Amino acid sequence: RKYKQAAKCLLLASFDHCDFPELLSPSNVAIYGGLCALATFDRQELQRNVISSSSFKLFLELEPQVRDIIFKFYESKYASCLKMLDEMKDNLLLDMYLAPHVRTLYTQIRNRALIQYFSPYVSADMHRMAAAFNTTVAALEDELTQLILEGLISARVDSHSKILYARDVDQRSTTFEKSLLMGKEFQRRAKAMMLRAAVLRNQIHVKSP
Amino acid sequence: SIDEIYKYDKKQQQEILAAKPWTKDHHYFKYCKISALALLKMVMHARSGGNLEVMGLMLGKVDGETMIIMDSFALPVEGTETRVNAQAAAYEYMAAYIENAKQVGRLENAIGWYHSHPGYGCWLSGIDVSTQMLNQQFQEPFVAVVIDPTRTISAGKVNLGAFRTYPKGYKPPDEGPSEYQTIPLNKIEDFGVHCKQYYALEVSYFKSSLDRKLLELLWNKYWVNTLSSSSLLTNADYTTGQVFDLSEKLEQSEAQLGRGSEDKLAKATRDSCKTTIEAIHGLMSQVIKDKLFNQINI
Amino acid sequence: EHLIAQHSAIKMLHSRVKLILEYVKASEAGEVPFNHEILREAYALCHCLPVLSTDKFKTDFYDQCNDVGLMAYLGTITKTCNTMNQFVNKFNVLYDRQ
Amino acid sequence: MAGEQKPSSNLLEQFILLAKGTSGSALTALISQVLEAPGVYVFGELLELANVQELAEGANAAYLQLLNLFAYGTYPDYIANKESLPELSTAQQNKLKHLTIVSLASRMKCIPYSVLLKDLEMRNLRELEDLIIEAVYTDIIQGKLDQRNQLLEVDFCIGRDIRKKDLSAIARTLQEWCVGCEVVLSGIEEQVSRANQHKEQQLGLKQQIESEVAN
Amino acid sequence: GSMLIKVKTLTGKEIEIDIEPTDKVERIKERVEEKEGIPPQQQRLIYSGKQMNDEKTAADYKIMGGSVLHLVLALRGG
Ligand SMILES: [Zn+2]
């Protein structure tokens, strides 16, 4: 599950080996590799890995499906992208080896679908966007609520807006509050250790009985 | 007289110059009477030198038991702190200067080594400890005149030390200061190789009454400049470099006190308190100006 | 040893604008020339009063002093942590075999 | 002739010799050519001459009214006192507007636009900032247009007039506040001669203690 | 200076200087500029078609009395 070096090799597909029936079906070869990547990557080097993929280009050209899948994925047609995503749900299941990580994959998939589109905006409107992702308004916002559980933007929603506003502005005052929290626990520890010097140097302990 | 010490008795001065008390005791020179030419271009040519190390000839003399620095300063050069006997190459300066300095009655002769480690001192490093030791077996009376430019920038005091190094054969007796100083990686090892081979001179300063009146009158219109510093903007980045350096020094104090450079934790606490004091006093002066001129309400 | 350069320059110009003050006072007093360019500048001055009320620098100086003060807070750290390390030393000295 | 902040430099001995030799109606012509002198709209040592003293309270007593207006009054005074003073040109009427407005910015850090719109009878933005930019264009005004505060940013003011006399009280209030900030800062000075002089003594003695701790 | 070498400009300005047999040409530069206003960093010290390291000893290149320390140097100083 350290799929970083996994895709590091997946990109490394060298057709000129040209034969091993136990190796992988080139359908599975490309889908396997590139989707380990599509989990692992950050977009830039991977587009490099993808748009500027040369050694994999046959492996590239194997599945036109997954090819334009990840293409317009990074181009963000999330609707049909996710569509064929959880359509090959069943067939990755049909992979013995795609089955064991379907949850992992689809998890990080819709995660990074978020990560992809959400980053530029400032206030997450949902209406047309939900029309895209094809998640019900509640299911949409609860996806979002999930997102709240971990998300990166100091963001809030008028539900009646049916729309987020994303992360806030200041980090300075943030530093301020962490600073004061710092200082308070500092003084706390400090008295603690004063009293600790007392208890030690005052011989203090607890017997066993 | 206040001018009694400005009197350069070339007779008396060059007499004690040829006196060779150091060959009888290499600890004879305890004092270092200085005229502020050392401070003058030592300071502003270590600072104007950026970070470029320098070298050369100091004006001066000797009086009683005293080396005397009439001059010390910097070059627009480099290489010092790593040069094989750097300082020599700038002596051409008063290869000429002092000569026709005698043409104005500056009948002085060459006495020492001007220099500066812009940003990190004025001294002689490992290769310059070859310099320092070799030359004090070459050139005694010789001194490691030591003041740090950026230390004197963020410090507010001139840590001057005339370091007659203990020549080979002569160990530090009772009085060897050996000013331990945080050295870069280049020369810290060789300082540990030679940290206890020098002592300091009791560096006093001599002047005229006109000198004091001039400095007071300097202040008497510089105070306007005093309330126009804006130096928290100046080296806040310097404070940041100290940020990194200090977290690093706490890393290294960690690594030292782990199992078993002496007590880097205590030294680090010391230097941290120091540099924080530095930034805080900068903020002091700046808040001073601020609250003053901004609490002027109509 | 710093602020006395402040003190010196301020006292120098203080003598300057105080001689100013003195021959000024004489202007309104008597037997010393009546000019309209004397105080007038003083009016300019009293409208030169505390520059930047602005709240701009107000926030700015919250910034400055908070920076230096949290610096000093960390240094409450530096001081008492050095003290703490020496305490743990001597705790490993007599309570323990350091 | 002489040169610092003032109107057209001819004016000093110009109107000296004029009031000296031009009087009554010649004095009126004197005054008419006095009228355009911006930085000296007030003639304290120029009304020093009895020729201007008869300029004043003579036929041109209304003009001494106007002169004191320059010294004391404002253009909005004329907006009320439309008949008291002598005639003025639209240029010079705007000049008295600039009187009161430079006095205002002299008062505030930045005077509001509506302030001079109303007191100086200024109707709209266009003419408003026209006379504004011409005032600043005189270079009396530093700073810039304080639009957001609806003010005029002010960094420097050249002296408008000679502004007959709070002069004594002016300079002595100056002495007052100068000494007041001085004494605030000097109490600070000796608190400093306390504290980190106290810091010298305290740490010196504490270090004496620490040194004597050994043996 | 025990070693009395020559620092020579491009036009042939050979200057007599007292240095040591381990005296740094790093400080020999300092010497040439403290003596002649021509600063040393365009006093590019080249030894036999190949540069002398600015951070070296003169005697590192078997430099001696009549030896040459190349400037190429400047004209305004001189
Ligand atoms: Zn060396």
Contact of B196 with B178, CB cutoff 8 Å: yes
C-alpha angle A197-A203-A207 in degrees, rounded to nearest 5:
120
Classify burial at D60, counting beta carbons within 10 Å of its beta carbon; exposed 0-12, middle 13-18, buried 19 or more.
Answer: buried
Give phi and psi for E68, each to the nearest 5: -125, 125
HSE (side-chain half, CA atoms, 13 Å) at D123: 2
Instruction: Calculate the CA E61 to chain-centre distance.
Output: 12
B263 carries a ligand binding annotation? no
How many beta carbons lie within 10 A of that of residue D18, not counting itself? 21
Contact of D140 with D102, CB cutoff 8 Å: yes
Q: Which of C64, C73, C94, C96 to mutate to test the interface with A (most CBs of A within 10 A)?
A: C73
The type of residue at B278 is E
Classify burial at D116, counting beta carbons within 10 Å of its beta carbon; exposed 0-12, middle 13-18, buried 19 or more.
Answer: buried
- Tokens 């010789």, residue located: B142
The type of residue at E28 is I
| β partners of residue E24 | E57
User: Which alpha helices (H) appear in A54-208, and where do they start and end?
Assistant: 57-60, 64-74, 78-85, 89-94, 102-118, 127-133, 137-150, 172-201
Contact of B114 with B90, CB cutoff 8 Å: yes
In this structure, what token pair is assigned to residue C54? 């602005």
Contact of D59 with D43, CB cutoff 8 Å: no
In this structure, what token pair is assigned to residue A202? 């005052």
C42 closest CA partner among C9, C26, C20: C20
Produce one character per residue of A107-119: b if its CB has 16 or more CB atoms within 10 Å, e if not.
Answer: ebbbebbbeeebe
C-alpha angle A9-A13-A15 in degrees, rounded to nearest 5:
160
HSE (side-chain half, CA atoms, 13 Å) at A35: 26
Pairwise CA distance, residues B201 & B28, whole Å: 10
Pairwise CA distance, residues A56 & A14, whole Å: 7
Residue D32 vs residues C58, D55, D73, E30: alpha-carbon distances, Å: 50, 12, 19, 74
How many beta carbons lie within 10 A of that of residue A39, not counting itself? 21
Q: Which residue numbers in chain B precede an interruption (C–N > 2.5 Å)? A: 260
B228 closest CA partner among B293, B277, B281, B280: B293
Pairwise CA distance, residues D203 & D178, whole Å: 36
**DSSP state letter for E16:** E
Instruction: Calculate the CA A74 to chain-centre distance.
Output: 14
**SS3 state at D61:** helix
Query: Residues near D100 by Cβ (< 8 Å), separated by ≥ 6?
Result: D74, D75, D76, D77, D116, D119, D120
Could you write out the three-class secondary structure of chain B? CHHHCCCCCHHHHHHHHCCCCCCCCCCCCCEEEECCHHHHHHHHHHHCCCCCCECCCEEEEEECCEEEECCCECCCCCCCCCCCCCHHHHCHHHHHHHHHHHHHCCCCEEEECCCEECCCECCCCHHHHHHHHHHHHHHCCCCEEECCCCCCCCCCCCCCEEEEECCCCCCCCCCCCCCCCCCCHHHHHHHHHHCCCEEEEECCECCCHHHHHHHHHHHHHHHHHHCCCCCCCCCHHHHHHHHHHHHHHHHHHHHHHCCCCCCHHHHHHHHHHHHHHHHHHHHHHHHHHHHHHHCCCC
Query: Residues near C72 by Cβ (< 8 Å), separated by ≥ 6?
Result: B276, B280
C65 touches chain D (CB under 8 A): no
Query: Residues near C73 by Cβ (< 8 Å), separated by ≥ 6?
Result: A179, A182, A183, A186
How many beta carbons lie within 10 A of that of residue D143, not counting itself? 16
Q: Which residue numbers in chain D precede an interruption (C–N > 2.5 Å)? A: none
Contact of B149 with B121, CB cutoff 8 Å: yes
Instruction: Calculate the CA B61 to chain-centre distance.
Output: 18
Angle between helices D61-71 and D90-107 (to 10 degrees): 30
B115 carries a ligand binding annotation? yes
In 3-state terms chain A splits into helix, strand, coil percentages (rounded to 5) of 65, 5, 35
A33 closest CA partner among B35, A55, D54: A55
Contact of D88 with D107, CB cutoff 8 Å: no
Classify burial at B236, counting beta carbons within 10 Å of its beta carbon; exposed 0-12, middle 13-18, buried 19 or more.
Answer: middle
**SS3 state at E51:** strand
Contact of D41 with D73, CB cutoff 8 Å: no
In this structure, what token pair is assigned to residue B162? 């005339």
> Cβ contacts (< 8 Å) between A170 and chain C: which residues?
none
C-alpha angle C64-C70-C73 in degrees, rounded to nearest 5:
145
Residue A18 region by backbone torsions, left for phi larger than 0, else alpha for psi between -120 and 50, else beta:
left
B21 C-alpha vs ligand 1 centroid, how far in Å?
26
Query: Residues near A203 by Cβ (< 8 Å), separated by ≥ 6?
Result: none
Give the H/E segment covering residue E68. strand E68-70
| Residue of E18, E20, E30 lying closest to B55 (CB–CB) | E30
**B/C interface, count of CB pairs below 8 Å:** 131
Mode of pairing for the β-strands spanning E3-8 and E14-19: antiparallel
HSE (side-chain half, CA atoms, 13 Å) at A154: 5
B130 touches chain E (CB under 8 A): yes
Classify burial at A50, counting beta carbons within 10 Å of its beta carbon; exposed 0-12, middle 13-18, buried 19 or more.
Answer: buried
Pairwise CA distance, residues C44 & D109, whole Å: 10
* Data resolution in angstroms: 5.9
Contact of A120 with A157, CB cutoff 8 Å: no
**SS3 state at A152:** coil
> Cβ contacts (< 8 Å) between D163 and chain C: which residues?
36, 40
Query: Residues near A58 by Cβ (< 8 Å), separated by ≥ 6?
Result: A13, A15, A26
Classify burial at A58, counting beta carbons within 10 Å of its beta carbon; exposed 0-12, middle 13-18, buried 19 or more.
Answer: middle
How many beta carbons lie within 10 A of that of residue C47, not counting itself? 17
In this structure, what token pair is assigned to residue D210? 């620490």
How many beta carbons lie within 10 A of that of residue B256, not counting itself? 16
Could you write out the three-class secondary structure of D76-137? HHHHHCCCCCCCCCHHHHHHHHHHHHHHHHHHCCCCCHHHHHHHCCCCCHHHHHHHHHHHHH
In angstroms, what separates the C-alpha of C86 from chain A's closest C-alpha? Answer: 12
- Tokens 């490992």, residue located: B126
**SS3 state at A165:** strand
The experimental method, as deposited, was: cryo-EM
E26 closest CA partner among E12, E38, E37, E40: E40
Contact of A88 with A56, CB cutoff 8 Å: no
The type of residue at E74 is A
Pairwise CA distance, residues B144 & B133, whole Å: 10
**SS3 state at A157:** strand
Chain E meets chain B (3+ C-beta pairs below 8 A): yes
Pairwise CA distance, residues A196 & D188, whole Å: 42
Pairwise CA distance, residues B250 & B267, whole Å: 10
**Cβ < 5 A residues, ion ligand 1:** B 83, 127-128, 131
| β partners of residue E50 | E47
> Cβ contacts (< 8 Å) between C24 and chain D: which residues?
171, 174-175
Query: Residues near A173 by Cβ (< 8 Å), separated by ≥ 6?
Result: none
Query: Residues near E17 by Cβ (< 8 Å), separated by ≥ 6?
Result: B89, B91, B92, B95, E1, E4, E5, E6, E7, E28, E31, E32, E35
E57 C-alpha vs ligand 1 centroid, how far in Å?
10
Produce one character per residue of B165-203: b if its CB has 16 or more CB atoms within 10 Å, e if not.
Answer: bbbeebebeeebebeebebeeebbebbeebbbbbbbbeb
> Nearest-CA residue of chain C relative to D41?
C36
Pairwise CA distance, residues B211 & B191, whole Å: 38
Residue B226 vs residues C20, C65, D189: alpha-carbon distances, Å: 22, 19, 14
Pairwise CA distance, residues B218 & B249, whole Å: 40
